[PDB]
Amino acid sequence: GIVEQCCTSICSLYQLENYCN
């Protein structure tokens, strides 16, 4: 999920945008 993608690995703006309301 988001913690694996952004915390364990490095994520992009577009990936973060996938989790917006």
Q: Residues binding another protein: what is the number (CB under 8 A)? A: 15
Say whether 21 sits in a helix, a strand or coil: coil
**Residue 19 · residue 2 · CB < 8 Å:** yes
- Footprint of another protein on 1-21 (CB under 8 A): 2-3, 6-13, 16-17, 19-21
In the structure encoding, which two tokens stand for residue 20, read together? Answer: 């917006």
Kindly state the smallest distance separating residue 11's Cβ from another protein, in Å.
7
Query: Distance between CA atoms of 8 and 3, rounded to whole angstroms?
Result: 7
* Binding-site ranges for another protein (CB under 8 A): 2-3, 6-13, 16-17, 19-21
